[PDB]
Short mmCIF file of C-alpha atoms and ligand atoms in Angstrom, two decimals:
data_model
loop_
_atom_site.label_atom_id
_atom_site.label_comp_id
_atom_site.label_asym_id
_atom_site.label_seq_id
_atom_site.Cartn_x
_atom_site.Cartn_y
_atom_site.Cartn_z
CA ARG C 21 -30.16 -12.72 -8.43
CA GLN C 22 -27.75 -9.98 -9.43
CA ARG C 23 -27.49 -9.14 -5.77
CA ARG C 24 -24.51 -11.34 -5.15
CA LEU C 25 -22.67 -10.18 -8.30
CA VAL C 26 -22.75 -6.58 -7.09
CA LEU C 27 -21.46 -7.53 -3.54
CA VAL C 28 -18.43 -9.39 -4.78
CA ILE C 29 -17.30 -6.68 -7.19
CA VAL C 30 -17.85 -3.74 -4.79
CA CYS C 31 -15.76 -5.85 -2.19
CA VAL C 32 -12.88 -6.31 -4.66
CA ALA C 33 -12.93 -2.51 -5.27
CA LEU C 34 -12.44 -2.00 -1.52
CA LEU C 35 -9.50 -4.40 -1.44
CA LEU C 36 -7.52 -2.75 -4.15
CA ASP C 37 -8.29 0.67 -2.81
CA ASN C 38 -7.03 -0.26 0.61
CA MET C 39 -3.77 -1.60 -0.82
CA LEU C 40 -2.64 1.64 -2.26
CA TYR C 41 -3.06 3.44 1.07
CA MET C 42 -0.27 1.42 2.67
CA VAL C 43 1.94 0.14 -0.09
CA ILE C 44 3.32 3.66 -0.76
CA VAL C 45 4.47 4.65 2.79
CA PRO C 46 7.82 2.75 2.63
CA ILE C 47 8.55 3.70 -1.00
CA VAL C 48 8.07 7.52 -0.60
CA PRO C 49 11.02 8.26 1.75
CA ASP C 50 13.41 6.93 -0.95
CA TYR C 51 12.75 9.46 -3.61
CA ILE C 52 12.65 12.50 -1.25
CA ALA C 53 16.40 12.20 -0.51
CA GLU C 54 12.35 18.79 8.09
CA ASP C 55 10.58 15.92 9.94
CA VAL C 56 7.30 17.93 9.58
CA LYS C 57 7.69 17.98 5.79
CA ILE C 58 7.09 14.22 5.23
CA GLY C 59 4.46 14.16 7.92
CA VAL C 60 2.08 16.53 6.08
CA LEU C 61 2.61 14.55 2.82
CA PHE C 62 1.68 11.31 4.59
CA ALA C 63 -1.37 13.00 6.33
CA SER C 64 -2.95 14.46 3.18
CA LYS C 65 -5.30 11.59 2.39
CA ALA C 66 -7.24 12.13 5.58
CA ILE C 67 -7.12 15.95 5.48
CA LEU C 68 -8.85 16.05 2.09
CA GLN C 69 -11.43 13.57 3.31
CA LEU C 70 -12.32 15.95 6.19
CA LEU C 71 -13.20 18.69 3.74
CA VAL C 72 -14.90 16.75 0.94
CA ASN C 73 -17.22 14.33 2.72
CA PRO C 74 -19.49 17.08 4.23
CA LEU C 75 -19.91 18.41 0.63
CA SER C 76 -20.07 14.89 -0.85
CA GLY C 77 -22.40 13.13 1.71
CA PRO C 78 -25.62 14.85 0.57
CA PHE C 79 -24.52 14.19 -2.93
CA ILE C 80 -24.42 10.50 -2.50
CA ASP C 81 -28.14 10.20 -1.47
CA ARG C 82 -29.16 12.09 -4.52
CA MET C 83 -27.67 10.02 -7.52
CA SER C 84 -28.37 6.52 -6.26
CA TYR C 85 -24.91 5.15 -5.30
CA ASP C 86 -23.57 4.42 -8.80
CA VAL C 87 -22.34 7.57 -10.44
CA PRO C 88 -20.32 8.34 -7.33
CA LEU C 89 -18.75 4.84 -7.34
CA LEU C 90 -17.74 5.21 -10.99
CA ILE C 91 -16.36 8.71 -10.26
CA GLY C 92 -14.31 7.36 -7.35
CA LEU C 93 -12.96 4.37 -9.38
CA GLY C 94 -11.90 6.79 -12.12
CA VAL C 95 -10.20 9.12 -9.80
CA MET C 96 -8.31 6.16 -8.22
CA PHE C 97 -7.17 5.07 -11.68
CA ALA C 98 -5.83 8.57 -12.47
CA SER C 99 -4.06 8.74 -9.06
CA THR C 100 -2.44 5.37 -9.48
CA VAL C 101 -1.07 5.81 -12.95
CA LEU C 102 0.73 8.94 -11.46
CA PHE C 103 2.61 7.32 -8.61
CA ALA C 104 3.92 5.28 -11.45
CA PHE C 105 5.30 8.13 -13.36
CA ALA C 106 5.97 9.94 -10.08
CA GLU C 107 9.33 11.34 -8.71
CA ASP C 108 10.35 14.56 -7.07
CA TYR C 109 7.96 15.71 -4.30
CA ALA C 110 5.16 17.90 -5.60
CA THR C 111 3.96 15.10 -7.84
CA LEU C 112 3.88 12.65 -4.87
CA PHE C 113 1.94 15.26 -2.73
CA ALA C 114 -0.57 15.69 -5.53
CA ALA C 115 -0.98 11.95 -5.97
CA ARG C 116 -1.59 11.43 -2.28
CA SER C 117 -4.17 14.17 -2.19
CA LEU C 118 -5.93 12.76 -5.23
CA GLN C 119 -6.01 9.36 -3.23
CA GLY C 120 -8.11 10.98 -0.51
CA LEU C 121 -10.24 12.79 -3.06
CA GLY C 122 -11.10 9.35 -4.77
CA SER C 123 -11.56 7.64 -1.38
CA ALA C 124 -14.09 10.19 -0.29
CA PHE C 125 -16.48 8.73 -2.99
CA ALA C 126 -15.74 5.05 -3.63
CA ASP C 127 -15.76 3.63 -0.07
CA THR C 128 -18.84 5.55 1.02
CA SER C 129 -20.76 4.59 -2.21
CA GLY C 130 -19.71 0.84 -1.76
CA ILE C 131 -20.75 0.62 1.83
CA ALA C 132 -24.03 2.40 1.05
CA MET C 133 -24.73 0.15 -1.79
CA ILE C 134 -24.04 -2.93 0.34
CA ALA C 135 -26.31 -1.73 3.02
CA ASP C 136 -29.14 -0.80 0.64
CA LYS C 137 -29.22 -3.91 -1.52
CA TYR C 138 -29.70 -5.88 1.71
CA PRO C 139 -32.65 -4.42 3.61
CA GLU C 140 -33.39 -7.30 6.00
CA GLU C 141 -31.57 -7.71 9.32
CA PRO C 142 -29.99 -11.25 9.23
CA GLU C 143 -28.31 -10.49 5.89
CA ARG C 144 -27.30 -6.87 6.31
CA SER C 145 -24.81 -7.79 9.12
CA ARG C 146 -23.70 -10.80 6.98
CA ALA C 147 -22.91 -8.63 3.97
CA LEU C 148 -21.22 -5.92 6.01
CA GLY C 149 -19.05 -8.58 7.55
CA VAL C 150 -17.82 -9.82 4.16
CA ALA C 151 -17.18 -6.16 3.22
CA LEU C 152 -14.91 -5.71 6.29
CA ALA C 153 -13.23 -9.06 5.81
CA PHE C 154 -12.36 -7.98 2.24
CA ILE C 155 -11.13 -4.51 3.51
CA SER C 156 -8.76 -6.07 6.00
CA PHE C 157 -7.13 -8.40 3.52
CA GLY C 158 -5.26 -6.00 1.21
CA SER C 159 -4.44 -3.65 4.07
CA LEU C 160 -2.97 -6.13 6.60
CA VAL C 161 -1.42 -8.84 4.36
CA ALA C 162 -0.73 -7.20 1.10
CA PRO C 163 1.75 -4.30 1.83
CA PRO C 164 4.58 -6.75 2.65
CA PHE C 165 4.27 -8.48 -0.69
CA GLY C 166 4.00 -5.07 -2.42
CA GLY C 167 7.27 -4.06 -0.80
CA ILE C 168 8.88 -7.32 -1.74
CA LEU C 169 7.77 -6.76 -5.39
CA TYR C 170 9.10 -3.19 -5.18
CA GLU C 171 12.58 -4.37 -4.10
CA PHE C 172 12.68 -6.66 -7.15
CA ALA C 173 10.95 -4.91 -10.10
CA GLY C 174 10.68 -1.26 -9.13
CA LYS C 175 7.67 1.09 -9.29
CA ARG C 176 6.52 1.35 -12.94
CA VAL C 177 5.22 -1.99 -13.98
CA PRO C 178 3.37 -3.05 -10.72
CA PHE C 179 1.51 0.23 -10.47
CA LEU C 180 0.39 0.12 -14.12
CA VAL C 181 -0.79 -3.44 -13.63
CA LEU C 182 -2.76 -2.37 -10.52
CA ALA C 183 -4.34 0.55 -12.43
CA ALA C 184 -5.34 -1.87 -15.24
CA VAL C 185 -6.98 -4.21 -12.74
CA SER C 186 -8.85 -1.30 -11.16
CA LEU C 187 -10.02 -0.09 -14.47
CA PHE C 188 -11.20 -3.63 -15.41
CA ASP C 189 -13.19 -3.85 -12.18
CA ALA C 190 -14.81 -0.41 -12.78
CA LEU C 191 -15.65 -1.40 -16.40
CA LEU C 192 -17.31 -4.61 -15.56
CA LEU C 193 -19.25 -2.84 -12.80
CA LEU C 194 -20.41 -0.40 -15.34
CA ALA C 195 -21.44 -3.37 -17.58
CA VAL C 196 -23.29 -5.13 -14.68
CA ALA C 197 -25.14 -2.25 -13.01
CA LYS C 198 -26.26 -0.61 -16.27
CA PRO C 199 -26.57 3.02 -14.94
CA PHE C 200 -27.34 4.25 -18.43
CA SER C 201 -31.20 4.01 -17.94
CA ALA C 202 -33.33 6.67 -16.33
CA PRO C 203 -37.12 10.69 -1.50
CA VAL C 204 -35.78 13.73 0.26
CA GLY C 205 -32.66 13.05 2.34
CA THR C 206 -32.05 14.32 5.83
CA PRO C 207 -29.42 17.10 6.10
CA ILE C 208 -26.18 16.16 7.69
CA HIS C 209 -26.63 18.65 10.47
CA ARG C 210 -29.79 16.86 11.73
CA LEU C 211 -28.08 13.51 11.62
CA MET C 212 -25.01 14.83 13.54
CA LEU C 213 -27.22 16.10 16.34
CA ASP C 214 -28.83 12.84 17.15
CA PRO C 215 -27.30 11.62 20.39
CA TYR C 216 -27.08 7.99 19.31
CA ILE C 217 -25.26 8.90 15.99
CA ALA C 218 -22.85 11.14 17.94
CA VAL C 219 -22.18 8.28 20.49
CA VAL C 220 -21.48 5.89 17.62
CA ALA C 221 -19.23 8.32 15.84
CA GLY C 222 -17.17 8.86 18.97
CA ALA C 223 -16.60 5.14 19.30
CA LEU C 224 -15.55 4.95 15.71
CA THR C 225 -12.64 7.37 16.42
CA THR C 226 -11.71 6.12 19.91
CA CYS C 227 -11.39 2.51 18.69
CA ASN C 228 -9.35 3.55 15.75
CA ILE C 229 -6.76 6.00 17.35
CA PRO C 230 -4.65 2.92 18.61
CA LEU C 231 -4.07 1.86 15.07
CA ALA C 232 -2.91 5.26 13.57
CA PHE C 233 -0.88 6.31 16.47
CA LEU C 234 1.09 3.11 16.40
CA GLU C 235 1.77 2.42 12.70
CA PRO C 236 4.44 5.12 12.16
CA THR C 237 6.09 4.79 15.53
CA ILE C 238 6.60 0.99 15.99
CA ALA C 239 9.46 0.10 13.82
CA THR C 240 12.05 2.43 15.41
CA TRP C 241 11.02 1.41 18.90
CA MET C 242 11.30 -2.29 17.99
CA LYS C 243 14.74 -1.78 16.38
CA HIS C 244 15.99 0.23 19.32
CA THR C 245 14.71 -2.05 22.05
CA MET C 246 14.69 -5.65 20.65
CA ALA C 247 17.34 -7.10 18.39
CA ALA C 248 15.23 -7.51 15.24
CA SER C 249 16.10 -7.70 11.59
CA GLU C 250 14.28 -6.37 8.66
CA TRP C 251 12.05 -9.46 8.33
CA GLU C 252 10.38 -9.14 11.66
CA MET C 253 10.14 -5.27 11.41
CA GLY C 254 8.36 -5.76 7.97
CA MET C 255 6.14 -8.79 8.65
CA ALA C 256 4.70 -7.62 12.03
CA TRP C 257 1.09 -7.11 11.09
CA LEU C 258 0.77 -10.10 8.83
CA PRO C 259 -0.04 -12.67 11.58
CA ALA C 260 -3.21 -10.66 12.51
CA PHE C 261 -5.53 -11.46 9.61
CA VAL C 262 -6.84 -14.60 11.27
CA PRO C 263 -8.08 -12.96 14.56
CA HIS C 264 -9.84 -10.31 12.46
CA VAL C 265 -11.92 -12.58 10.33
CA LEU C 266 -12.54 -14.85 13.36
CA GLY C 267 -13.89 -11.86 15.33
CA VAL C 268 -16.00 -10.81 12.35
CA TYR C 269 -17.51 -14.18 12.01
CA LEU C 270 -18.09 -14.47 15.82
CA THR C 271 -19.90 -11.13 15.92
CA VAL C 272 -22.08 -11.94 12.92
CA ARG C 273 -23.08 -15.31 14.41
CA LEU C 274 -23.76 -13.71 17.82
CA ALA C 275 -25.85 -10.91 16.18
CA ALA C 276 -27.86 -13.58 14.38
CA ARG C 277 -28.48 -15.52 17.57
CA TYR C 278 -29.22 -12.64 20.00
CA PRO C 279 -30.35 -9.22 18.55
CA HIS C 280 -30.07 -6.09 20.61
CA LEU C 281 -26.65 -7.05 22.01
CA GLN C 282 -24.72 -4.81 19.75
CA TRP C 283 -24.00 -2.41 22.43
CA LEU C 284 -22.54 -5.21 24.55
CA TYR C 285 -20.36 -6.34 21.67
CA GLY C 286 -19.17 -2.85 21.07
CA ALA C 287 -18.26 -2.39 24.77
CA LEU C 288 -16.44 -5.70 24.87
CA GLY C 289 -14.44 -4.74 21.71
CA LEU C 290 -13.50 -1.39 23.25
CA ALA C 291 -12.40 -3.01 26.43
CA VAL C 292 -10.31 -5.64 24.49
CA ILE C 293 -8.65 -2.80 22.41
CA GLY C 294 -7.74 -0.88 25.54
CA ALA C 295 -6.27 -3.94 27.20
CA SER C 296 -4.24 -4.87 24.18
CA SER C 297 -2.83 -1.39 23.71
CA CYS C 298 -1.98 -1.19 27.39
CA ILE C 299 -0.29 -4.63 27.32
CA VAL C 300 1.79 -3.74 24.19
CA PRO C 301 4.61 -1.88 26.00
CA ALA C 302 5.65 -4.92 28.03
CA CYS C 303 6.60 -7.32 25.21
CA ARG C 304 10.41 -7.85 24.83
CA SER C 305 10.20 -10.57 22.16
CA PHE C 306 8.69 -11.14 18.74
CA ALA C 307 5.97 -13.73 19.81
CA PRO C 308 4.47 -11.64 22.72
CA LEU C 309 4.38 -8.53 20.50
CA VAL C 310 2.63 -10.52 17.71
CA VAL C 311 0.11 -11.86 20.31
CA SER C 312 -0.53 -8.37 21.54
CA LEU C 313 -1.15 -7.13 17.94
CA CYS C 314 -3.45 -10.09 17.48
CA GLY C 315 -5.48 -8.91 20.39
CA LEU C 316 -5.50 -5.35 19.16
CA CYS C 317 -6.63 -6.38 15.69
CA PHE C 318 -9.36 -8.69 17.03
CA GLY C 319 -10.72 -5.89 19.15
CA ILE C 320 -11.30 -3.72 16.17
CA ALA C 321 -13.30 -6.22 14.20
CA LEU C 322 -15.89 -6.66 16.90
CA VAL C 323 -16.55 -2.99 17.22
CA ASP C 324 -16.68 -2.42 13.47
CA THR C 325 -19.04 -5.29 12.70
CA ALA C 326 -21.26 -4.52 15.72
CA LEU C 327 -21.60 -0.71 15.14
CA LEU C 328 -21.67 -0.52 11.35
CA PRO C 329 -25.17 -1.95 10.78
CA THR C 330 -26.41 0.13 13.79
CA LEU C 331 -26.04 3.36 11.91
CA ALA C 332 -28.23 2.16 9.12
CA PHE C 333 -30.74 0.64 11.57
CA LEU C 334 -31.06 3.95 13.35
CA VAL C 335 -31.44 5.92 10.13
CA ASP C 336 -34.08 3.54 9.04
CA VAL C 337 -36.12 3.57 12.26
CA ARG C 338 -35.91 7.42 12.51
CA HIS C 339 -35.21 10.22 10.00
CA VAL C 340 -35.58 9.10 6.32
CA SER C 341 -34.76 5.55 4.91
CA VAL C 342 -31.87 6.83 2.73
CA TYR C 343 -28.21 5.97 3.42
CA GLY C 344 -25.06 7.59 2.09
CA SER C 345 -25.28 10.67 4.30
CA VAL C 346 -24.93 8.53 7.47
CA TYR C 347 -21.63 6.79 6.52
CA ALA C 348 -19.99 10.09 5.65
CA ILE C 349 -19.99 10.68 9.45
CA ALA C 350 -18.12 7.34 9.97
CA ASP C 351 -15.60 8.33 7.25
CA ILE C 352 -15.16 11.76 8.85
CA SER C 353 -14.64 9.97 12.27
CA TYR C 354 -11.87 7.75 10.73
CA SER C 355 -10.23 10.71 8.95
CA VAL C 356 -9.70 12.45 12.29
CA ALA C 357 -7.36 9.79 13.74
CA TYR C 358 -5.78 9.15 10.46
CA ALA C 359 -5.08 12.87 10.08
CA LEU C 360 -3.91 13.59 13.67
CA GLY C 361 -1.72 10.44 14.00
CA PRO C 362 1.14 10.52 11.48
CA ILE C 363 1.98 14.14 12.24
CA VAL C 364 2.17 14.43 16.05
CA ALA C 365 2.76 10.70 17.09
CA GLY C 366 6.53 10.84 16.51
CA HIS C 367 6.85 14.18 18.42
CA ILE C 368 4.77 12.83 21.37
CA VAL C 369 7.02 9.77 21.51
CA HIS C 370 10.14 11.90 21.30
CA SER C 371 8.96 14.16 24.10
CA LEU C 372 7.33 11.62 26.44
CA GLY C 373 8.38 8.11 25.36
CA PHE C 374 6.77 5.02 23.93
CA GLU C 375 5.66 3.69 27.38
CA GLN C 376 3.29 6.56 28.09
CA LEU C 377 1.57 7.08 24.72
CA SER C 378 0.21 3.53 24.67
CA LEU C 379 -0.87 3.92 28.31
CA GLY C 380 -2.82 7.02 27.49
CA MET C 381 -4.44 5.38 24.44
CA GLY C 382 -5.47 2.38 26.46
CA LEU C 383 -6.86 4.58 29.26
CA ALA C 384 -8.91 6.64 26.72
CA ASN C 385 -10.29 3.47 25.07
CA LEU C 386 -11.16 1.86 28.45
CA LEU C 387 -12.78 5.03 29.74
CA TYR C 388 -14.92 5.54 26.55
CA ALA C 389 -16.01 1.86 26.69
CA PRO C 390 -18.70 2.53 29.45
CA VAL C 391 -20.12 5.37 27.35
CA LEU C 392 -21.49 2.82 24.84
CA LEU C 393 -24.00 1.73 27.47
CA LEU C 394 -26.45 4.46 26.40
CA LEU C 395 -27.58 2.38 23.46
CA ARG C 396 -28.96 -0.47 25.68
CA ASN C 397 -32.50 0.83 25.02
CA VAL C 398 -32.31 0.51 21.21
CA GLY C 399 -34.37 -2.16 19.54
CA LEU C 400 -37.58 -1.09 21.37
CA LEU C 401 -37.74 2.26 19.40
CA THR C 402 -39.04 0.26 16.35
C1 ACH I 517 -6.85 -3.52 10.78
C2 ACH I 517 -7.74 -2.82 9.67
O1 ACH I 517 -8.77 -3.34 9.38
O2 ACH I 517 -7.28 -1.70 9.03
C3 ACH I 517 -8.31 -1.15 8.13
C4 ACH I 517 -8.36 0.33 8.43
N1 ACH I 517 -9.71 0.69 8.76
C5 ACH I 517 -10.13 0.33 10.09
C6 ACH I 517 -9.88 2.19 8.70
C7 ACH I 517 -10.75 0.19 7.83
#
């Protein structure tokens, strides 16, 4: 039925949205010409998400996951046409803030719609795997090509083309869902106080710190230590798409085979992330570094695919069977690392070094990994 047509289009919206969050970080430092001046500009997407999601979470579970998606895809189009006609600084800051304002709606609505259109267990974790595989591509493989096109054509035409594509996607979604025709949700305070939800939300931030504390402070370290040209410094995350999709598929197949092993999968993913981030400050060549990044990226996929359906399963077993207000917690959790990283990571590296920050990150992840054992009793609460 329609069901598949909605899943594909929502996934494409998550791919284009995740491309504009990373294709602009190399371009911005060109038009600017205070190390804490750029940092706040780069850390404005997550700051706004931390003040809008609490006031937008309960709004999602009241208008049925369609009006918020359209609003988000309109705000994203408005934000994109701007970078295109954007120069100076204030305009860029406003565009970056509008990006977060638009992301506080679209991603949450899309994930909620994917989780709600699929109520059964063997298919929910299969749809939420395709959603994550579509999110990864476009954030891990696309920014290099965006930069290559920037160094050839500029900024005006590509951004207008991307805005046109986003508007086309929003329009055909409006034509397919047909929103132009015609239960009480749990308050976010009650959801946040549930111990299992808090445990899951803590993991969603611990497993993501060693991807926002490394992105802004890897190129300089690579250039200083290893003799690397622009090509390796630019295409350093590209050979990591394959481990991500492989891990997503493996987690989906294992969840289908044995239920109630999501906690084990999450703990294994946390251990892998910690081991990779601890191994990273040892590579003195391109290939070992690429392998370490492969391990780090394969660690994230397991945790994400294992613990994303768990929130919906818990909010279905207990509380009220309405989503939208339970993924705002996940978005808030992400927007803590993505707001605290790009501002203080450089100062931490400059005051301590690159060989201690990674050690601390790995120790934190490996120490939080045992905490996920408290979910071993889930599956009998049904
Ligand atoms: C590696 C990767 O998937 O990056 C996506 C960012 N994230 C985890 C917030 C969706």
